[PDB]
């Protein structure tokens, strides 16, 4: 039901793919260094809520 | 009374045809659901009125009378 | 600008302002559509300037009536009031600037506020206003007043100016960005800067003196004087029970500063995302549109207000005085209810006159949902209030669900002040204590939320389906206020958004009341009430404490709450006090039975009545020429509505009151 | 434009020109020859048509301070850009597209999305299209549920049914019944299930009496045949996963 | 008291006979109606016995049909 | 119009063109019809003007008298005054001691 | 002037009250439902209008209808 | 001598030139549950913005365009509509089940609101 190619300025559809995109890989990286830092230094990255 | 209940009912029917497996199944066309007509509506109304009035006062007659 | 064209010639004409009432009283409902159509300018005769210069004039009058109210309560306190006894003692004293007259037995009324005063005690919390205004002389409440009736005079000129001033071409109504930067920047950054400057300049040295002791005249005429580094709301003030007027007035002057700040990042264009709101902006440019939207903000804020003002306490013992905070809270609840469905009221009113939003166009999903949100919501809620009813009467409490049986616990309701272990207290009440939820509260909540759901769904109906709908594809041109369309296609009763409305009403105060019950029962069980004595404390709680154990089910709320705390009003006609509450609880009775007669009643019995009973003056020659006429139908059910509404809240009114006064004397 | 007598060298005082080309692109081309009555462009014509070059150069104090008032600032009309957006939006909602959104607390956010509301059927508001029901995975899944799912015979459909049903429906008594906590509430559960499997298979049979579907019908066939041996085997299958629960509850505590 | 009131305002109601006069009360009559009913026992009494108080029921509408035309 | 006697009233088409001062010495003053009831016309002034404007509504006793007249007034001073003197009775003669 | 001929009673007109005789489609439209059609390289539609042999419903009630008006009470001119 | 139009079943007609340009809505007819239908034509001299019996609202095109609707009370509040709009070539049929079309609104080619020769009471 999507129209990708749709010349509209209401098409962002590459932006929400490229913040995805973003937000994934940053993702990919916190929680790989996350649990690094867990493992290694017992650090959790503690939040205060 | 008895539009806003149409519609209601109307949108619960589109609900419900609009519903994957029941649609299937059911079509509406026989026994249709429909808001109480307008006397029919009085009438009920009447006997919801009818019967709170009258048997919420024998528990209250019982109670202080025993 | 010409001042020449207004006369009170058409004083007498009694409704030059709508066409359809030219040919003058031919029957009563001439006169019952005069009063309805009075004040829809949008109808009457003239033009879309016209209309800007009747709304904005007939604000500016009502900002005058507002002043003059706001006048004559200072004056009251002034001249009529036992200010000055409540401010040297505020617990021995009620607050009452309130005296009624000796004329036929009615002295009676009047009660004992202190040696030297008798009169009726006050609950609008306005002698604790005062106190943190720092108004505590009769030469400052008289200055007050005067201050008050000059800006009431000042509105009634601008309205009456403002009536000519603006002609055809004024358009500043219509400059929103620039309405909305002058208030944004200067009624609310300045206001709230100024006033705070106003506390810190006048009330705190005045409240610092008064919590010490000092009475004394050159003193009443160093921030931070008093207050530690705890945070704000984490220590009320000992001696008065109330967050610190420092850090009230501090938080004045963050609140400016942030709107201030807020108004110039608009200005300088800051924010961004003005793609996502441009479909609003270009659709709600509608008095009726900004209507609705501001009903419902003010609606949210008042309902914020009731909940803040109780639970958060700011006032000078307001905490304490008991009757005051449920007042407060009772009434801004009210309002906000009646705010959201006359915000429900007005967006159907901008759907019929201008188009609609785009949501509209799957309303029959949106309505679907939550139809079955709301029976889904009342089902799961109400009926666990009938299974603990069944349940408990057939004698199995281990069946039911509470605290002791099967208990439904509110996890998701977390603490987020982090206050200290205890309760605070001033002089032998409480005047700060956390309010522990359990499975009452889980299903009061779900309650509150199954009939606020319900409202919503009432008001949204009526909003999507005001054009067309299945039944009815003219709803446009049928408009906003009719009776039906017939008794066609099965009947077509009520479909209109005015109908609408006149069903949410009834849910909405079906829902206040519930939540006004719900906060009486649970402030008098676990909240209020004294105390008995490192120290630990025995609570005597007013209620005693019942809440948790009786409310989980109707009966409970019945017998608890309903009979067993309207021993107060109903037992009230000897005692000085409270027998006018008792005569308005009885009052407020009839006239809610008094409106079922409009709820349930159709319009023609009673024309055929009023047609019977003319016979007989036309046979003695008592021929009225304004013929006599049965109400409409939609009047029935306005007159209907107004008093079944009136009648219920005047018996929680005087109920609620009544128990509050005898209780705290 | 310069066929416009009152456009022509209007006075910067009575207003600037940034702010007149602003309100003439904002104001619809048709309007300009005679705008409406309640317009900016209208309190314009009006305006300059009296004050000017060859005509009144001076005016009141409060007169001019009135025309200031009621004449729009810069700020107060749309942009170019909000201009092209306003239209985009509207475009696309005419065409029977919808620029996605998803309502979020007191308000909907937009996804980026452009999505073809319109179906097949263009008249047909069953056929709306949305993720819900008309995106790939619901459609997949939708076809792939035992009551629609291909080459599955009646029995099949019907047994599979009965199996979850059961399997689930025993729950609810054996963990909230009168007797949860004698001995017996699995047993006692397991045969409030089976009751309520049967009461919705007899449901099912009066509903394949009465309406008679005839979507499982084999092709020369009695109606609703399909429809019955399929509420059949659902009364069996209800069973079965009714006591196969019980069974791992009892064997497994 | 209240024969006084009934009848000022019959009183009134016939001499004006006019819709715009009930609307806008013509207030001199009003006052001299009000003033005048002090004698409305007698005057009462002598129009029900000479006939001018009640009309016959065939000069006003009865009602509904009940029956074929 | 008493109002405006003497004064120099150009129509939009002559403005600028006629630039007589009035009996007061005032320029001549721009009349404009708005089709507005409550505004029929309205006047622009062509510069700095030196002229009576009344600001207070032109009110006459007739109309107060009528305005008085609707039946609601009648009525509601009726209904007053009588309850007024109801109240007045009870406060003069309290709790019917004579009867 | 109505072509329309009551089939009950000759004389009254037909209970249609219209005056042009229907129009019978070159083809007339085959029962159908709306069920999904696979695509046989992964793809699925959701609303294809497939054939459908009977009744969608075999009850009484529901095949006793004709739609020749109400209540299948006009003549077969209006079919 | 009045002409019934084709009027294809709206199932058959997916896509028309006829068709207005109309936003949609789910106040269309339901295509699962129902298979009797109203058509009205008609034909527009410019493309007048209308509001749609069903939700939301449309554009016609210059030229011949053709709705489908579920109810003849829609497809005459439609008529009216164009009528105010000054429309009087609009015409309105019933689509059965099978496809057959019944000339409806104009019923004998004059408004019924005008008098015409050959009407009995
Ligand atoms: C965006 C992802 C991300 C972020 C924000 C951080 C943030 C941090 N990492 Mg790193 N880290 C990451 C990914 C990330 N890491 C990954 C993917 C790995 C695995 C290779 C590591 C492995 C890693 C180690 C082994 C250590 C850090 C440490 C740190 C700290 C460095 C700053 C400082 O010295 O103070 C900080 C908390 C240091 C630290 O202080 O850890 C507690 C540290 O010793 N990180
Ligand atoms: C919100 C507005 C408001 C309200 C609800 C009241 C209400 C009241 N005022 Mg009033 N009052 C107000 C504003 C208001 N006031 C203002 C602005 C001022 C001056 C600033 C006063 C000054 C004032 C005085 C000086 C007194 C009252 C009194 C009263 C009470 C009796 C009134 C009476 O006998 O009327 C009688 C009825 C009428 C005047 C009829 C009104 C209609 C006709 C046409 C006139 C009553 C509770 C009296 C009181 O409390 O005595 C114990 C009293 O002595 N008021
Ligand atoms: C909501 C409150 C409000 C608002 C928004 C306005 C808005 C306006 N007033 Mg003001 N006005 C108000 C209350 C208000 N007034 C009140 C209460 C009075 C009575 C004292 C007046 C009396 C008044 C007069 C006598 C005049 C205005 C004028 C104006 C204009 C602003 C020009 C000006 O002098 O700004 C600076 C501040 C504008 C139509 C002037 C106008 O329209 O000039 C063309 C004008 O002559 N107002
Ligand atoms: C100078 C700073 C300052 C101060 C002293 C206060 C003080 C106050 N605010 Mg706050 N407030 C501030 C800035 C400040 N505010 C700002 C900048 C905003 C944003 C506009 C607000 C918005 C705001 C709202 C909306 C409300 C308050 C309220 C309050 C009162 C109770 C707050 C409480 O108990 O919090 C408890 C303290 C904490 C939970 C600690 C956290 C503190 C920060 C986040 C760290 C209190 C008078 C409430 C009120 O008036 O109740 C009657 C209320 O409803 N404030
Ligand atoms: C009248 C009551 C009311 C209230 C109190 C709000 C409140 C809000 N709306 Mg709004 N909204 C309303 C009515 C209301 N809306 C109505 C009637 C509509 C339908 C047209 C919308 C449509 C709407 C949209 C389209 C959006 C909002 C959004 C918002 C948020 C803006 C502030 C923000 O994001 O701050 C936080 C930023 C820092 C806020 C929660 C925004 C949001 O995020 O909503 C979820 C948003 O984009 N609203
Ligand atoms: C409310 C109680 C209730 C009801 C309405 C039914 C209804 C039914 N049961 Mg029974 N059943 C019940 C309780 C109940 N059961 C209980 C408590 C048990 C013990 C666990 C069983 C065990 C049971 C078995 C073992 C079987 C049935 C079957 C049936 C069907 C009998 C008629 C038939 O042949 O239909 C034809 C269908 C019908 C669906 C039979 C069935 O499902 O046949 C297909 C079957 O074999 N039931
Ligand atoms: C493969 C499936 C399966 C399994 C492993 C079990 C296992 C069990 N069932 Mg049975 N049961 C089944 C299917 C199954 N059931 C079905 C389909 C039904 C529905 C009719 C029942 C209804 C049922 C009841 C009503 C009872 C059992 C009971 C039992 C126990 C003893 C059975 C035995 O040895 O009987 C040997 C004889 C043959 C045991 C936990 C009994 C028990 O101990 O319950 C706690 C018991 O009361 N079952
Ligand atoms: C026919 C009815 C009636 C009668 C016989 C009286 C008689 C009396 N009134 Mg009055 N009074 C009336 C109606 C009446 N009143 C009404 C309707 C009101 C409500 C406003 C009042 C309110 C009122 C007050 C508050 C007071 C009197 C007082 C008095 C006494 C002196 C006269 C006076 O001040 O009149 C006043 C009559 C009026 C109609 C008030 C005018 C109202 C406005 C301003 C319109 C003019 C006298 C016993 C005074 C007195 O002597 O008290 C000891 C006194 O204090 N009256
Ligand atoms: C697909 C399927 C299914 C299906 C189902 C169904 C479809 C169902 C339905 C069902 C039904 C369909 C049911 C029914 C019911 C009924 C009822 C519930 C009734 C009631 C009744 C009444 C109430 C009545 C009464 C009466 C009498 C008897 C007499 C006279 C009077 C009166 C009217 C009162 C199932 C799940 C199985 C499984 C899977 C598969
Ligand atoms: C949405 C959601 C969800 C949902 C889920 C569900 C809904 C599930 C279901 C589940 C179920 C519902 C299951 C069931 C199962 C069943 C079974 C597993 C059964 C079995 C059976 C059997 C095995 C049987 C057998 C038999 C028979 C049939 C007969 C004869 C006898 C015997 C025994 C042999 C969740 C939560 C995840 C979360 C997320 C979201
Ligand atoms: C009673 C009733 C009437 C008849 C009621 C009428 C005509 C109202 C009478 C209006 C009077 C004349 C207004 C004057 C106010 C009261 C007489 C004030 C009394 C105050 C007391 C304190 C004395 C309707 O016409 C009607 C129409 C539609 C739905 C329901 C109903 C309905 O319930």
């Given at each position: 039901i999507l129209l990708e190619d749709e010349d509209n300025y209401w098409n962002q559809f590459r932006k929400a793919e490229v913040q995805e995109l973003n937000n994934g890989r940053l993702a990919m990286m916190a929680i790989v260094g996350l649990i690094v830092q867990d493992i290694f230094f017992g650090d959790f990255g503690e939040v205060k809520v | 009374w008895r539009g806003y209940w149409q519609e209601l009912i109307d949108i619960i029917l589109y609900m419900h045809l609009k519903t994957p497996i029941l649609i299937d199944l059911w079509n509406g066309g026989v026994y249709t659901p429909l808001a109480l007509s307008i006397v029919q509506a009085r009438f009920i109304g009447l006997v919801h009125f009818t019967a709170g009035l009258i048997l919420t006062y024998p528990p209250f007659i019982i109670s202080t009378t025993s | 600008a010409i001042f020449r064209y207004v006369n009170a010639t058409l004083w007498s004409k009694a409704g030059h302002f709508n066409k359809a009432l030219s040919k003058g009283a031919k029957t009563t409902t001439w006169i019952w559509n005069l009063h309805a159509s009075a004040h829809d300018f949008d109808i009457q005769q003239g033009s879309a300037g016209l209309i800007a210069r009747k709304v904005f004039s007939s604000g500016l009058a009502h900002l005058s009536l507002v002043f003059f109210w706001l006048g004559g309560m200072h004056f009251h306190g002034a001249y009529l009031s036992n200010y000055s006894a409540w401010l040297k003692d505020p617990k021995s004293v009620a607050p009452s600037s309130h005296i009624a007259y000796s004329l036929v037995g009615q002295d009676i009324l009047?009660?004992?506020?202190?040696?030297?005063?008798?009169?009726?005690?006050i609950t609008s919390g306005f002698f604790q206003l005062y106190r943190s205004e720092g108004i505590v002389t009769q030469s400052q409440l008289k200055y007050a007043c005067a201050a008050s009736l000059i800006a009431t005079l000042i509105c009634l000129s601008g309205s009456y100016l403002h009536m000519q001033l603006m002609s055809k071409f004024t358009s500043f109504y219509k400059k929103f960005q620039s309405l909305s930067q002058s208030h944004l920047i200067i009624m609310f950054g300045f206001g709230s800067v100024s006033f705070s400057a106003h506390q810190i300049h006048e009330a705190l040295p005045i409240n610092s003196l008064l919590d010490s002791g000092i009475w004394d005249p050159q003193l009443f005429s160093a921030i931070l004087l008093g207050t530690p580094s705890a945070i704000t709301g984490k220590l009320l003030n000992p001696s008065t029970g109330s967050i610190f007027l420092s850090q009230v007035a501090a938080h004045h002057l963050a609140v400016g500063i942030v709107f201030i700040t807020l108004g110039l990042i608009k200005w300088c264009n800051l924010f961004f995302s003005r793609n996502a709101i441009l479909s609003l902006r270009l659709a709600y440019m509608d008095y009726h549109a900004q209507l609705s939207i501001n009903l419902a903000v003010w609606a949210s804020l008042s309902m914020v207000a009731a909940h803040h003002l109780t639970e958060?306490?700011?006032?000078?013992?307001?905490?304490?005085?008991?009757?005051?905070?449920?007042?407060?809270?009772?009434?801004?609840?009210?309002?906000?209810?009646?705010?959201?469905?006359?915000?429900?009221?007005?967006?159907?009113?901008?759907?019929?006159?201008?188009?609609?939003?785009?949501?509209?166009?799957?309303?029959?999903?949106?309505?679907?949902?939550?139809?079955?949100?709301?029976?889904?919501?009342?089902?799961?809620?109400?009926?666990?209030?009938?299974?603990?009813?069944?349940?408990?009467?057939?004698?199995?409490?281990?069946?039911?669900?509470?605290?002791?049986?099967?208990?439904?616990?509110?996890?998701?309701?977390?603490?987020?002040?982090?206050?200290?272990?205890?309760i605070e207290v001033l002089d032998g009440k409480i005047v700060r204590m956390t309010q522990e939820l359990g499975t009452a509260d889980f299903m009061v909540h779900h309650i509150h939320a199954f009939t606020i759901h319900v409202t919503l769904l009432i008001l949204l109906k009526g909003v999507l389906y005001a054009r067309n709908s299945r039944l009815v594809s003219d709803k446009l041109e049928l408009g906003f206020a009719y009776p039906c369309d017939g008794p066609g296609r099965g009947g077509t009763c009520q479909i209109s958004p005015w109908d609408h409305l006149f069903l949410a009403v009834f849910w909405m105060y079906n829902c206040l009341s519930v939540v006004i019950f719900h906060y009486f029962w649970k402030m008098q069980s676990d909240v209020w009430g004294s105390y008995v004595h490192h120290s630990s404390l025995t609570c005597s709680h007013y209620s005693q404490g019942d809440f948790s154990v009786n409310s989980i089910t109707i009966n409970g709320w019945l017998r608890n709450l309903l009979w067993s705390e309207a021993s107060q009003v109903i037992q009230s006609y000897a005692l000085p006090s409270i027998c006018s509450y008792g005569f308005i609880f009885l009052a407020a009775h009839f006239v809610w039975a008094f409106s079922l007669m409009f709820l349930f009643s159709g319009?023609?019995?009673?024309?055929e009545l009023i047609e019977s009973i003319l016979w007989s003056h036309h046979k003695l020659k008592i021929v009225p020429h304004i013929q006599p006429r049965a109400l409409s139908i939609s009047q029935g059910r306005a007159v209907g509505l107004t008093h079944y509404v009136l009648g219920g809240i005047g018996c929680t009114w005087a109920f609620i009151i009544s128990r509050m006064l005898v209780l705290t004397t | 434009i310069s066929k416009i007598a009152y456009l022509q060298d209007v006075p910067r005082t009575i207003l600037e020109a940034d702010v007149l080309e602003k309100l003439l692109m904002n104001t619809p081309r048709d309007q300009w020859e005679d705008p409406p009555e309640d317009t900016y462009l209208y309190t314009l014509k009006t305006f300059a048509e009296v004050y000017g070059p060859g005509k009144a150069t001076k005016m009141g104090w409060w007169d001019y301070f009135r025309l200031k008032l009621d004449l729009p600032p810069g700020f107060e009309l749309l942009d170019e850009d909000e201009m092209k957006v306003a239209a985009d939006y509207d475009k696309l909602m005419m065409e029977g597209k919808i620029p996605f959104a998803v309502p979020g607390p007191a308000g909907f956010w937009y996804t980026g999305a452009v999505i073809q509301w319109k179906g097949k059927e263009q008249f047909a508001g069953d056929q709306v299209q949305t993720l819900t029901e008309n995106g790939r995975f619901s459609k997949q899944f939708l076809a792939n549920l035992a009551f629609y799912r291909d080459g599955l015979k009646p029995w099949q459909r019907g047994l599979e049914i009965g199996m979850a049903h059961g399997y689930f429906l025993i729950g609810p008594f054996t963990s909230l019944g009168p007797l949860r906590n004698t001995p017996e509430a699995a047993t006692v559960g397991l045969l409030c299930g089976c009751a309520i499997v049967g009461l919705v298979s007899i449901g099912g049979l009066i509903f394949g009496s009465t309406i008679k579907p005839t979507r499982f019908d084999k092709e020369g066939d009695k109606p609703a045949s399909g429809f019955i041996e399929m509420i059949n085997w659902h009364a069996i299958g209800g069973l079965g996963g009714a006591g196969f629960a019980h069974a791992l509850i009892t064997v497994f505590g | 008291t209240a024969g006084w009131i009934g009848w000022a305002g019959r009183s009134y109601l016939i001499r004006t006979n006019?819709?715009?006069?009930?609307?806008?009360?013509?207030?001199?009559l009003a006052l001299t109606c009000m003033a005048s009913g002090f004698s409305w026992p007698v005057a009462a009494w002598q129009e029900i016995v000479n006939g001018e108080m009640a009309v016959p029921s065939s000069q006003i509408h009865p009602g509904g049909p009940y029956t074929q035309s | 119009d008493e109002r405006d006697e003497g004064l120099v009233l150009i129509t939009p088409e002559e403005s600028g063109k006629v630039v007589k001062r009035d009996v007061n010495n005032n320029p001549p003053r721009i009349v404009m019809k708005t089709n507005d009831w409550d505004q029929p016309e309205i006047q622009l002034s062509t510069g700095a003007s030196n002229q009576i404007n009344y600001i207070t509504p032109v009110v006459a006793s007739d109309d107060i008298k009528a305005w008085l007249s609707l039946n609601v007034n009648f009525f509601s001073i009726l209904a007053l005054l009588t309850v007024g003197g109801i109240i007045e009775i009870q406060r003069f003669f309290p709790d019917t001691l004579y009867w | 002037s109505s072509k329309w001929v009551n089939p009950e009673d000759p004389?009254?007109?037909?209970?249609?009250?219209?005056?042009?005789?229907?129009?019978?489609?070159?083809?007339?439209?085959?029962?159908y439902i709306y069920t999904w059609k696979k695509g046989e390289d992964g793809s699925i539609e959701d609303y294809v209008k497939t054939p459908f042999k009977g009744p969608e419903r075999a009850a009484d009630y529901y095949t006793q209808r004709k739609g020749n008006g109400a209540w299948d009470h006009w003549g077969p001119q209006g079919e | 001598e009045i002409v019934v139009e084709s009027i294809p079943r709206p199932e058959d007609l997916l896509e028309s030139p006829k068709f207005p340009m109309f936003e949609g809505s789910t106040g269309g007819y339901m295509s699962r549950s129902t298979r009797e239908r109203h058509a009205i034509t008609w034909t527009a001299k410019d493309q007048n913005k209308f509001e749609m019996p069903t939700g939301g609202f449309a554009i016609m095109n210059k030229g011949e365009n053709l709705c489908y609707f579920r109810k003849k009370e829609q497809c005459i509040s439609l008529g009216k509509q164009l009528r105010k709009m000054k429309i009087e070539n609009y015409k309105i049929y019933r689509l059965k089940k099978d496809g057959t079309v019944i000339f409806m609104h104009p019923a004998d080619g004059v408004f019924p609101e005008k008098v015409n020769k050959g009407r009995v009471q």
């Open positions: - | - | 009047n009660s004992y506020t202190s040696q030297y005063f008798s009169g009726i005690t958060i306490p700011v006032y000078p013992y307001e905490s304490t005085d008991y009757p005051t905070v449920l007042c407060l809270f009772v009434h801004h609840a009210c309002l906000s209810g009646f705010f959201t469905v006359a915000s429900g009221a007005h967006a159907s009113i901008f759907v019929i006159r201008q188009l609609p939003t785009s949501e509209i166009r799957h309303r029959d999903p949106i309505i679907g949902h939550l139809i079955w949100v709301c029976i889904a919501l009342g089902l799961h809620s109400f009926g666990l209030y009938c299974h603990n009813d069944t349940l408990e009467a057939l004698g199995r409490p281990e069946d039911t669900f509470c605290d002791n049986s099967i208990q439904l616990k509110p996890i998701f309701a977390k603490q987020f002040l982090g206050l200290q272990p205890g319009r023609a019995y009673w024309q | - | 006019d819709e715009t006069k009930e609307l806008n009360i013509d207030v001199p | - | 004389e009254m007109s037909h209970p249609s009250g219209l005056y042009v005789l229907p129009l019978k489609p070159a083809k007339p439209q085959e029962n | -």
